[PDB]
Symmetry: D2
């Protein structure tokens, strides 16, 4: 099974797996049961932004979700990445729907990672930025239902021709190249990621959420990981 570190934008409260009773942002380290969460005032059908930061100086993973002219939602947690992830990973975005549903559209996505070795400026870096997705996006690995459309967006879960979202859907997009996220001779290892997202639901109740995740390089969608498992976890433990 895979090793997952994720930040979750969770739109549907599953309280029997420890979700608080409201939509929330959370930090997940090898379990869907978040290590920390914060209340998130999710807004149905408005474009929002998420920003995930990590530095190995403070060993703290932090995230903010906001919408224009709204208060932000923020969460942070101690994370020693050398203790949780292999040296090489892939990075991605995942989303699901279950019995309830929502569009999980990504409008842009950026990532940067930097690894300063032993030496005085001996830095390796990777940066990518998608402000538009093409129909053939060859630097994305799409898993499950995820697709990139002729409209320039990344739809992580299934949406019908009339634009309405489907239940029981799960899909992911991982940057194509593996990422060196830590190295034992690194003075500073750190990364950041941002994406813009549009979650819309005809339901009164949207489900299930979108997550930015970092995984083993060979990570695939766990069987039956629709609904509350967000495409990331094989079970609710």
């Amino acid at each position: 099974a895979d090793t997952i570190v994720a930040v979750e934008l969770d739109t549907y409260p599953n309280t029997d797996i420890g979700d608080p009773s409201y939509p929330h942002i959370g930090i997940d380290i090898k379990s869907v049961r978040s290590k920390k969460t914060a209340k998130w005032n999710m807004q149905n059908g408005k474009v929002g932004t998420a920003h995930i930061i990590y530095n190995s100086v403070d060993k703290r993973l932090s995230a903010v979700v906001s919408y224009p002219n709204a208060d932000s939602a923020t969460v942070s947690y101690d994370v020693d990445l050398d203790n949780v992830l292999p040296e090489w990973v892939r990075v991605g975005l995942s989303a699901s729907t279950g019995l309830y549903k929502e569009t999980n559209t990504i409008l842009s996505w950026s990532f940067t990672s930097k690894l300063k070795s032993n030496s005085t400026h001996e830095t390796n870096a990777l940066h990518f930025m998608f402000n538009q997705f093409s129909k053939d996006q060859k630097d994305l690995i799409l898993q499950g239902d995820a697709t990139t459309g002729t409209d320039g967006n990344l739809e992580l879960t299934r949406v019908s021709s009339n634009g309405s979202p489907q239940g029981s859907s799960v899909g992911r997009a991982l940057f194509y190249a593996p990422v060196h996220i830590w190295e034992s001779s690194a003075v500073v290892a750190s990364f950041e990621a941002t994406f813009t997202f549009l979650i819309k639901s005809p339901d009164s109740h949207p489900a299930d959420g979108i997550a930015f995740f970092i995984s083993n390089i060979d990570s695939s969608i766990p069987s039956g990981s629709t609904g509350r498992l967000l495409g990331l976890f094989p079970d609710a433990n």
Copy 2:
């Protein structure tokens, strides 16, 4: 008087102002008496690197100092920059010597700052990088004894023609343009800074240290701020 947030590389223990009894790295918020410190195994005449990071998600200022093939020194502290600094600042490097002395040579210096407003990618950024300093470095404001040499380095305190450092010296270099470090409509405000430094002492005992600081835009060297005040503070309170 000025408002100062600094990270100090303190080579000389002044225990009557709360220095621990060894060279140390520290975080200074409006006082020379560090809010936090860590033991620093300073190495006389070897090139070292310092890395300072801040993000407004976790509101944590962190720093690492290291030398190649040595263990690092690290410190972190809660810092709400909107509560400590004006919206606009200058950024700089400062150093001093007192009754004891040392070269305070800077071999390179980089900074980046980013301010994401209200909106989805509404980001302002500034980046500079000096990997060599010229004799006329017009984007640096030099204060006190600091100079840039024909050898490509920034000498913050006074060094004689034979290369030996002088006592009772204080000098600073601030990037020329003011920096927008926070804004009340910012989702994410953050910055990073790195410099490489060479501190050499013929003494058995080096003094006094080098600091990366952020100040009010009109900051100048406080009178008599040689020795333990590191060019940053008008008194020891």
Copy 3:
């Protein structure tokens, strides 16, 4: 006198001083009389983009101006910068109106310069990016009529309360820090600039245009440079 290198987006044909008979983009080297122009299909009231690039490998200054879903306008010219400019300069945007008028609204401005010396990676760099402008934009030097308004835009030339543009106006905006654009010991020197702009006019003929420029650091608006001289030049020579 000032020393000016500039890319002009010239909306008004001044045929008596060398302008082709149509709106055009031009590369201007120490004279309002463009070294090279291309036909520019300027679009009243639509946001356009301009992109200016230079590298010392080819020593070719090029520019492209475009609108979504229209054909681009492009111009290129030999220029040895060590030949025309001082080593240190400022960069800026300029605009004017005269008898005829237009808004000269700047919605974003990015610039990046790099200067690689003698050595194998010994590169200095400056980058700044404005995706919104505040009311007190301290890292800009505003000259003449230029203001940064409540809407988050930079208005280079005077705009009335009702957003309508005014005649005989001239304004510039310069980045605060000087920029090191060449050095005799650089293996590669190079820069790019980008800005988005909104030129709108109640008139039949808009005037007079917008330019990105590079100048001696102490450059000011020459006297009598409203209208056809675009805030850049003292006369039409």
Copy 4:
């Protein structure tokens, strides 16, 4: 067959297939027979730098190779990339030896590509930077003899235990992710690459050279491309 665009650092004169009579740098478009060359004063056993740049504004591919404190070698050529390459490519470095030999050691490699679509800032980008290479460099595709060693370097061609270079060797290294180098809807498409290199030879005549190249994504070393074909081309046409 592969489709190759490449800048060659050609240390060995193969005059019977079009080489000038001296070591040279060259711009190669779908043939080992360079479209444009310049005289290259290659220096045995000294670290050099190469810098390759392209922009779709001028559609000029240029390159400069230099050593500290020597004159630079420079070459430039018209190239419409939508004309020669597929929309998606890989990038890489290639090198070979034949009867004559040299180390083809890479100490650092940086690359940045940007593709600005239709819209006012709708830019996709990729950047990667290697200032050291590890033993398992997972984001490189190594082909032929190429290895990443214990010294932190990439050895493109076979080097013995005692650091001495071997004959009839060929190796390449490609960045793992495909790169989107052009798109019919881009206002500006552009890239730069830089690498530092150490070519050393016990021989009187070093051979055969190093190249930075761009290829179809499924490019492999053509058969029989050791020596004068630089690991890039199946024949000398």
